[PDB]
Design a protein around this nucleic acid. Sequence first.
DNA 1: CGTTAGGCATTAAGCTGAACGCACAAAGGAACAAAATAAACAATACCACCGAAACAAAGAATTAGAATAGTATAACGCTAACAAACATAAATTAGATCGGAAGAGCGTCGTGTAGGG
DNA 2: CCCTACACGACGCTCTTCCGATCTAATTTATGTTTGTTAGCGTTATACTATTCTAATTCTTTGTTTCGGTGGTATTGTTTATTTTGTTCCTTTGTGCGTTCAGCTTAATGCCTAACG
Lengths: 87, 84, 97, 98, 77, 95, 95, 110, 110
Amino acid sequence: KRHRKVLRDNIQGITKPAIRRLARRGGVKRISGLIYEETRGVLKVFLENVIRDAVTYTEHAKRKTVTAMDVVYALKRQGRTLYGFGG
Amino acid sequence: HRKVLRDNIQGITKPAIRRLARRGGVKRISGLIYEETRGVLKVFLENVIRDAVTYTEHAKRKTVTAMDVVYALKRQGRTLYGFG
Amino acid sequence: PHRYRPGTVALREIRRYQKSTELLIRKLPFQRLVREIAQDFKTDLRFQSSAVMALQEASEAYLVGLFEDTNLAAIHAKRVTIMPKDIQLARRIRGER
Amino acid sequence: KPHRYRPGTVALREIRRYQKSTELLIRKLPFQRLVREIAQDFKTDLRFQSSAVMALQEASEAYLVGLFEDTNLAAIHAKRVTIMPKDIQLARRIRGER
Amino acid sequence: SGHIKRPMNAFMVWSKIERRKIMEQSPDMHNAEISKRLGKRWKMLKDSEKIPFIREAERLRLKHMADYPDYKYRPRK
Amino acid sequence: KRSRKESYSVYVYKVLKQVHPDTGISSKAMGIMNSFVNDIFERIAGEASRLAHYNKRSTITSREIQTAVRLLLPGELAKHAVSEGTKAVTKYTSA
Amino acid sequence: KRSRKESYSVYVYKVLKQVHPDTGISSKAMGIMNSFVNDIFERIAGEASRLAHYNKRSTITSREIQTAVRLLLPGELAKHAVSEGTKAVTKYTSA
Amino acid sequence: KARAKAKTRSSRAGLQFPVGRVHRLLRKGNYSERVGAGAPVYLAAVLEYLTAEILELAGNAARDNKKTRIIPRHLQLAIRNDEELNKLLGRVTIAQGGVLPNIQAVLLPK
Amino acid sequence: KARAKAKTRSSRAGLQFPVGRVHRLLRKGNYSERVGAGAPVYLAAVLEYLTAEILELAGNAARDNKKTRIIPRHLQLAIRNDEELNKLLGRVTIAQGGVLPNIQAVLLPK
DNA sequence: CGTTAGGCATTAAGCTGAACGCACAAAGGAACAAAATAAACAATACCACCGAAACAAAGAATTAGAATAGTATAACGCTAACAAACATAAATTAGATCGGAAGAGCGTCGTGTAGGG
DNA sequence: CCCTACACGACGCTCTTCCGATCTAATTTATGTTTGTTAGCGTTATACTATTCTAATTCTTTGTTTCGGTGGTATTGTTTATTTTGTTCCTTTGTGCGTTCAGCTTAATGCCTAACG
């Protein structure tokens, strides 16, 4: 089949070589086989907390689109400010 | 007022730090924790007190009051309560 | 007949990825995942490309800080690999929960 | 020969007593002396109230108890019970200051 | 799968044949570069040279409308 | 003449014997509650300020502070707050 | 008509060929530098705002922003900044 | 001349917080130029509920320790025991409130 | 009527930042009612030095990698290698800047 | 000595034409990715043993509350005065819109390197 | 000791993208009031420190004792280096719908006077 098993693992689209890339940026040598789903839990909690803020921003401003500067404001909410987009 | 205060870093005592760790849920204490705790406390109090000094030097005072220490802890993200 | 001892190419992977600076996640899985998550709040929520790209950038920066933290935690723990105990330790000491 | 308890029961008793307590731990006069002796290095001849040094005592208390709770959470991870300077260095590294 | 595809535009009408020509004439050449060069060529092409493809695209659009009248188009995930 | 230093303490007392007509409170917790109210007011008004600055609107309305308490308050507390807030401005606009 | 979206980019270019008359810069780092300038300006002006609110003064002066950069900037950077800032307002007040 | 009877806006909302105080407090608070009419109403509502809720759990903790005076220790257990609002008050520590009682599950003896 | 020659305040300070822009930017920036005359002068001075300094180390990093275009990778090594200003920029991460090279001293092989 | 009732500049609330964003069609490989095998080494189970730290009496500065002397210092009330706010051009200038040029990607050679017998 | 699979300089093509020139709304900056915050000076009262008295208290000190830390040896199992197939994902212009924007009209609205707890 095109998709293995029952699929529906959009978060499992961030595959184990990709998490291996993110880990090898982070200066780790060996990775245990029980890192990936917990890293995915970090993905869930971080993206929920940012996307909730950004959708609150764009829902107050009567707009159906999410602007990158609203994402920068939502990351300025949590001390998580990035650069390169304006501010 | 005719004195320059020096050598009070060990004014805090070893069993007081032990009691601090007893509040902190810590069980056993090695003999090296005390100097490091004194250094950590000294640099933390150095930072907050330096903030309160430049606070008081802005507002044309000669003494330090409590609300400036509240503003120092508010600027450092360590906001305390019960002092206005 | 040229099977390497495990770890030398790991050092080489460390050097190539720390020397490199581009994005590390394929953009379409992250796009579909963000499209999945954002529909749970409200419907018909499109994004700019800079929005999604920014989200991938912030997520990757948060993850690389987290994994540097957990690797330092693991090496304090006298081990040379990471475990989810190190993950929840770094999520505790940094104060997230 | 007086009876001595096994080491830890006295420790656990004072854990429950001191975490149950509400009063200030660090003695007020050496704390006052340390605050004045480190305050004189920026702008000398500085006076404080009772309220400022009391709030400073509370801030120091909160920061130290958080530091030691996180240090104990570090030291439990190493399958250890005591604390070490490497534990405090790990704690101040994960906090983001050192 | 049941999804109804878009009609080919004029670029598509020209790009399909020319991409087939480039693959036949110049093999072992990666397809992305071929698409970049076809884009460049189409941008260099004079307007007058493009009338058969334009008209062809329009005819395909008419046939699409006749064959798929409910195509108002509503893309869904 | 003399500096008059105000707080919310009578309203703390009033909401105290509103919810619990039996218990008292020290001067310690009264000052704690006063710093509580002014810190939450500061954070809410500053968030509403930057939201008005982003949406190019020169005012603060009920919508702006509603977005602000939707932003700051985590979870069910925000839902409770927005429900009673709409209740309160319907009370205020009814008269 | 159309929204005009401004930045500081020409002044980034000007200080660039001030310090280094040889090197260029991508559009990436130009936007980075623009967010850098507006974020540091936001933090400095907000700190000066709350300092004016505490000292019961309705204005912002050079003293207020001097206290603000004394507060935010850690270390020798603050000392360098206050020295050149006093230099700059002596230049401005000389004319 | 003769004005009408002075009805306050706190009476206009069934409210126990001063509307005019927070109205001028926003007005001199330098957050925007104009201020909407119902926005201090909304503000006073959410502040009343926030502290009203704090009071409800604090008094239950204080009566739970059989004392009728509110102690900052009771405040500490109220804001640290309930996790719904602890996330708002993570970086804020109560003076003279101590640490909520806790113990590591491994440090019990065998 | 005939005004004098338009001398800007940036020319009045030997300055490369727009004084009038930050003057109105404080004026509409809603921080206080009145604004002092030399406070945008002070502001423009410290912003010019902050970025001027960033430029000095960034260009040294970029020439140090033998390229004459400024790359956000060079920005990342400039703001992470020097510790004097890293403490200002702890919670701020550069987009497309990567992570500064750093390897654990124990993970070298024997 | 603090809060509330009337009168208009000024600001958003709809409202419609118009510019902008984004998905998505064919065509291909190709970078990527999932799975399977030694292997090896690193986490781990556990033992010795040891010295470094808990328990606890005996004294030892020392805080701990209280006056109190005095005393530099927040914390006032009028000014006035200097500095900013509010009209009013003009003129620079910052930014939008087209042009070239060189700076860096692609790669490819050979070179040096530093890892499995 | 051995040789030998992957990172770097010289150079040429290549394309792209960023530096240079030019026109034009706009907004920045000299005048000239009004007005209104705040240095500055007299005052004052006030809260903070120095000093000294009981006292109590808790820190140190000198031991016992005991148990966790650490080094060491099996051990095993679990991840890696590598191949071997799956597999999804890069690029381009034109078409269609959805959304946002900006000018425009118009209705709310709160800045600024005058009286009750």
